């Protein structure tokens, strides 16, 4: 029935896909999610929206999903839509490995899921997936990689990017302090804590960090412990205190 049909996969007079744009609006409300690429690794730092005294910690993380032996991802949007997509990312990765007996090269896994998101915007009459994803991984072709994908099924590779709440503010803050080719996982962790401190309102229980490194020819994916996060957060407070001394004393002399 045409009366009840929402017309989700049609164009607007300015060549615009409104359901896609409205899905992007939802992503803005989800927790801040950032990714930083370094020479010795790549990381995901995300704002935790499941913060409540009566919540129970049953899972390893809240927004970090291991996809394959060399890849992991983080999401921003409708968390049930993210569970659908992350499950499919795992199936695509297993299908590639069954076929070639090699892990799926990072970009290929991204394009595969993006083609599914794209289909949802061209045909079917269904609403799009209200999710933006950040992918971290390693492969024998391009090494450490960071990717970003949108409800449109659009993607790009990045050195540092942000999705979710205050994304633009975090991206411009990354644009200033990211030094191409001269980033180590130690300096990227400090930049992740610096950016999140400003784009949020900072306890280790409201944040979630994961790193992807190479150790002895094997990929290591680890979500940092709550104590480890307090240490990076504390060092950031001890850098802001030292910065206030190099402004009040560097004006007199």
């Amino acid at each position: 029935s045409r009366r009840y049909d929402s017309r989700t996969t049609i164009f607007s007079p300015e060549g615009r896909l409104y359901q896609v744009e409205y899905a992007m609006e939802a992503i803005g409300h989800a927790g801040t999610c950032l990714g930083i690429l370094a020479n010795d690794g790549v990381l995901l730092a995300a704002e935790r929206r499941n913060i409540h005294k009566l919540l129970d910690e049953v899972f390893f993380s809240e927004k970090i999903y291991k996809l394959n032996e060399d890849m992991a991802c983080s999401v921003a949007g409708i968390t049930s839509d993210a569970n659908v997509l992350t499950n499919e990312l795992r199936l695509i990765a297993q299908r590639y490995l069954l076929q070639y007996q090699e892990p799926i090269p990072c970009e290929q896994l991204v394009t595969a899921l993006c083609d599914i998101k794209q289909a949802y915007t061209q045909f079917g009459g269904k609403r799009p997936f209200g999710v933006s994803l950040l992918y971290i991984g390693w492969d024998k072709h391009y090494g450490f990689q960071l990717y970003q994908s949108d409800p449109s099924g659009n993607y790009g590779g990045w050195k540092a990017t942000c999705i979710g709440n205050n994304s633009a503010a975090a991206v411009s803050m990354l644009k200033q302090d990211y030094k191409e080719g001269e980033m180590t996982l130690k300096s990227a962790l400090a930049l992740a804590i610096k950016v999140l401190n400003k784009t949020m309102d900072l306890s280790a229980e409201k944040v979630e960090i994961a790193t992807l490194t190479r150790e002895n020819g094997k990929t290591v994916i680890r979500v940092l412990k709550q104590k480890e996060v307090e240490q990076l957060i504390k060092k950031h407070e001890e850098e802001e205190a030292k910065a206030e001394r190099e402004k009040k004393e560097k004006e007199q002399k």
């Binding site: 069954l98 070639y100 090699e102 290929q108 024998k140 072709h141």
Partner: protein
């Protein structure tokens, strides 16, 4: 009834195949080529039933070429050998099983040279040397006797010639000429055909 042979050295893979295309009691072609280029550094040597061999080899070749076009890089010899195995194994219990016996020879920047043997059942084996056809029954023991893992390409061609001479001597089928190619860090190199008067 057709012959395939591969000898893998320290930094190369030497391959050869007969040049006969036959029908019933007649040699229809004396210059037929049984090798298929998949990538710049991979050859698929294919043998078996009349229709199946070219249909199967070409389908794999075009899908390997499709991978290169979609991603900007080529499949490794291992990934190509496993992709070939997956297709052959998927057709095995289907309406359309392909009766093809093959060898995949390749060079990878990281893994080095590789030789894979595959039978029509889709069993896949990595081998220092291998042969397909009735000829393998007369030549496998020659390779067992003379092959060493450090065999130079110069010595490998002498060993290949020893195998091809045995076929001229003892094999009841004609097989007078053989295509010869070698793969290394610089791709696929055509060598002179082995010919017998």
């Amino acid at each position: 009834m057709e012959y395939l042979i591969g000898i893998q050295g320290p930094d190369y893979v030497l391959v050869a195949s007969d040049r006969v295309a036959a029908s019933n009691i007649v040699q229809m072609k004396d210059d037929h080529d049984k090798m298929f280029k998949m990538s710049e550094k991979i050859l698929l040597l294919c043998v078996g039933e009349a229709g199946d061999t070219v249909q199967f080899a070409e389908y794999i070749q075009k899908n390997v070429q499709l991978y290169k076009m979609r991603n900007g890089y080529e499949l490794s010899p291992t990934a190509a050998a496993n992709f070939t195995r997956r297709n052959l194994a998927d057709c095995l219990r289907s309406r359309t099983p392909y009766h093809v016996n093959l060898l995949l020879a390749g060079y990878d920047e990281h893994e080095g040279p590789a030789l894979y043997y595959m039978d029509y059942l889709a069993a896949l084996a990595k081998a220092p040397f291998a042969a397909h056809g009735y000829g393998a029954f007369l030549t496998l023991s020659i390779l067992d006797r003379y092959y060493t893992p450090t065999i130079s390409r110069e010595r490998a061609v002498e060993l290949l010639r020893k195998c091809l001479e045995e076929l001229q001597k003892r094999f009841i089928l004609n097989l007078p000429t053989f295509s010869v190619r070698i793969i290394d860090k610089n791709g696929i190199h055509d060598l002179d055909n082995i010919s017998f008067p």
